[PDB]
Amino acid sequence: SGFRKMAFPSGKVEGCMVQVTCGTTTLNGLWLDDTVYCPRHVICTAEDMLNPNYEDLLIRKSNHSFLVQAGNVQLRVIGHSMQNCLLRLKVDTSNPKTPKYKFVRIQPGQTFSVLACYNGSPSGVYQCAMRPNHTIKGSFLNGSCGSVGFNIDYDCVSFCYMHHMELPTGVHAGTDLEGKFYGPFVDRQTAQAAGTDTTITLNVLAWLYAAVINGDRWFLNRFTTTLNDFNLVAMKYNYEPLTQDHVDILGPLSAQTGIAVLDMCAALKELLQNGMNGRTILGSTILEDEFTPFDVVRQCSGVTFQ
Amino acid sequence: SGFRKMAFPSGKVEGCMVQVTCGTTTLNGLWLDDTVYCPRHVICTAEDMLNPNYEDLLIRKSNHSFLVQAGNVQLRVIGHSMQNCLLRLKVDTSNPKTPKYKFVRIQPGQTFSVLACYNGSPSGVYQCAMRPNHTIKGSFLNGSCGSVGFNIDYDCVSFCYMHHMELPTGVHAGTDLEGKFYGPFVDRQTAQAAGTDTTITLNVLAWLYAAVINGDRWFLNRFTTTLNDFNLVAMKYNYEPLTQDHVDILGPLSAQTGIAVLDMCAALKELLQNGMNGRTILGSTILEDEFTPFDVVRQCSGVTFQ
Numbered sequence: 001s002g003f004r005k006m007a008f009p010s011g012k013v014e015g016c017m018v019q020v021t022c023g024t025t026t027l028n029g030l031w032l033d034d035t036v037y038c039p040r041h042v043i044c045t046a047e048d049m050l051n052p053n054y055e056d057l058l059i060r061k062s063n064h065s066f067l068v069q070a071g072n073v074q075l076r077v078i079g080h081s082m083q084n085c086l087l088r089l090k091v092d093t094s095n096p097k098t099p100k101y102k103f104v105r106i107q108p109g110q111t112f113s114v115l116a117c118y119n120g121s122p123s124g125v126y127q128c129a130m131r132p133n134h135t136i137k138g139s140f141l142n143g144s145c146g147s148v149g150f151n152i153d154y155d156c157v158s159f160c161y162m163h164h165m166e167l168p169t170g171v172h173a174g175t176d177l178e179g180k181f182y183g184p185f186v187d188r189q190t191a192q193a194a195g196t197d198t199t200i201t202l203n204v205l206a207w208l209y210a211a212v213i214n215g216d217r218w219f220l221n222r223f224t225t226t227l228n229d230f231n232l233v234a235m236k237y238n239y240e241p242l243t244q245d246h247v248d249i250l251g252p253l254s255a256q257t258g259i260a261v262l263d264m265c266a267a268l269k270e271l272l273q274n275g276m277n278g279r280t281i282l283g284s285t286i287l288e289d290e291f292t293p294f295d296v297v298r299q300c301s302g303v304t305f306q
Numbered sequence: 307s308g309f310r311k312m313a314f315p316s317g318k319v320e321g322c323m324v325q326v327t328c329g330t331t332t333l334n335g336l337w338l339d340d341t342v343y344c345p346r347h348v349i350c351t352a353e354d355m356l357n358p359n360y361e362d363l364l365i366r367k368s369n370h371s372f373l374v375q376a377g378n379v380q381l382r383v384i385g386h387s388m389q390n391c392l393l394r395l396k397v398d399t400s401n402p403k404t405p406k407y408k409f410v411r412i413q414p415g416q417t418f419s420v421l422a423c424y425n426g427s428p429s430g431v432y433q434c435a436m437r438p439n440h441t442i443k444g445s446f447l448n449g450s451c452g453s454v455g456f457n458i459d460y461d462c463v464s465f466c467y468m469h470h471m472e473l474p475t476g477v478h479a480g481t482d483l484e485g486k487f488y489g490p491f492v493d494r495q496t497a498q499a500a501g502t503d504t505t506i507t508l509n510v511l512a513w514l515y516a517a518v519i520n521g522d523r524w525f526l527n528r529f530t531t532t533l534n535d536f537n538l539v540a541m542k543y544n545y546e547p548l549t550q551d552h553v554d555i556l557g558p559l560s561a562q563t564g565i566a567v568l569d570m571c572a573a574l575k576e577l578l579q580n581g582m583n584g585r586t587i588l589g590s591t592i593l594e595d596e597f598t599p600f601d602v603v604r605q606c607s608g609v610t611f612q
């Protein structure tokens with residue numbers, strides 16, 4: 001029993017974290033095989049930052065412009081190239097700690113673990129959901145550029161996020177491991193701001209199913225709803241529309257609990273309209289949207305507490 | 307910016323997790339140097355469980371009663387002994403992945419990271435607070451016996467918790483690494499239940515200081531309070547008494563923010579009496595008590611956003 005924001009064990013990623021310095025700017029990089037990945041930010045100074053031309057900044061660098069340190073060992077850079085908003089630095093040594101891995105671009109509403117790092121040294125680990133508005137509610141200080149997000153599937157580390165910057169409201173933005181930003185954001189100092197966010201309906205529903213698997217039915221009701229009537233309520237409360245694809249994704253959780261998706265939708269509609277009446281669901285006073293259907297299957301028993 | 311329940315990176319602990327089997331019972335153990343630690347539960351079957359005499363159960367075992375597996379490698383047991391509620395199994399091989407480490411008994415209100423494990427294989431990591439009533443709000447399924455809790459200080463892994471069992475309300479109980487239970491609990495199937503809990507006043511206060519360091523003052527007021535008058539309100543709302551020792555612990559956070567402890571106490575008293583008026587503090591709709599003063603200093607900037 002229990003239900004917690006649970007990160008993946010971070011060890012396979014810790015063995016990949018290095019420090020990268022160019023001039024006076026230091027940040028974190030990711031060492032896989034004979035390549036180190038890091039934000040292209042590393043070639044900027046504070047004065048470069050309002051209007052940097054990375055192409056023009058980069059051509060002025062040599063391999064030995066870059067200092068890469070894995071603990072006490074210096075890794076010699078023997079090639080560099082820019083790919084979107086990241087640099088790929090080729091180094092003389094292949095990381096013996098490289099795990100089996102993949103690069104994936106995650107979709108909004110999906111979750112991943114973040115290994116917050118400073119000066120190449122891992123410091124903390126927590127789970128994030130990719131918001132609909134392409135930001136994450138992270139916890140990052142100066143020096144955290146190049147901290148990575150990942151999921152782990154069996155042997156294999158799926159890398160999905162490299163951290164870049166903090167937006168005016170204190171949420172965080174970054175890129176996949178091809179260096180393409182999540183969202184409309186750019187690695188420049190501008191007035192850019194996160195767009196209006198929305199609640200991730202499919203996750204809230206997954207989390208209601210979690211509650212039932214764990215033994216709680218207080219919020220269910222005798223009603224059902226159509227997809228359409230549900231979505232009218234969703235629009236009023238700033239929840240994403242429910243789609244048939246999402247209903248289909250909820251199939252296994254519905255089958256384990258014996259509650260039809262559209263019946264759970266009715267329960268949610270009631271919760272939105274009437275509130276929770278001073279009660280909790282899985283320890284929470286609010287409706288939680290930071291767990292995917294997969295996160296629920298991962299963490300909950302396969303046997304419902306009936 | 308940001309503020310999250312942040313676990314320590316779990317890698318130094320993952321390299322210590324093994325599987326231990328005796329008869330048909332399997333669970334997790336902790337391999338440090340040439341010793342494996344695990345719950346003494348491993349020598350019980352379901353029928354042993356209502357009234358087990360561990361002394362009597364253990365004397366019937368030999369070293370080769372115990373199967374210890376670190377991945378694909380069998381570790382041969384060459385000695386065993388019982389210490390309170392754990393077994394210490396001496397093995398033929400010293401763990402080459404042993405980190406620098408210490409065993410510590412944590413105090414109620416303190417926090418630690420939990421590496422949830424199954425069959426010797428780490429599966430997730432999250433932060434827990436030791437409740438005043440000596441339980442943790444974990445997330446554990448069958449097979450999680452022997453999952454460990456730890457903090458990391460510089461080089462050094464401070465082990466503080468080995469998981470044993472789940473109580474009737476779904477919260478969790480276990481021991482330090484000397485095998486002594488946190489709380490009045492016993493490793494038997496009885497009607498035992500967690501005692502009445504209380505809110506950890508010192509942590510709530512630390513978390514209010516976190517909010518100010520991160521730039522938010524909405525909940526402050528023009529009032530002060532005496533320790534006594536505060537504690538009368540605390541008693542009404544089931545919060546721990548504030549003590550001068552705790553006020554002293556808050557010294558650094560008070561100095562960084564320029565808010566006197568007893569002035570922050572007044573703000574808390576107002577929040578308790580009047581509620582939060584539909585607002586949030588660090589993203590939360592409720593007063594959070596699962597972060598210590600140390601956790602706040604660890605995660606927040608040393609510079610207040612004034």
Ligand SMILES: *C(=O)c1ccc(N(C)C)cc1
Binds near residue numbers: 144187
């Ligand atoms: C670190 O990688 C990084 C990247 C971008 C920015 N800004 C665009 C301000 C800051 C730090």
Ligand SMILES: *C(=O)c1ccc(N(C)C)cc1
Binds near residue numbers: 345469
């Ligand atoms: C696993 O270590 C463990 C320990 C104790 C119990 N009970 C006392 C039921 C169960 C599992």
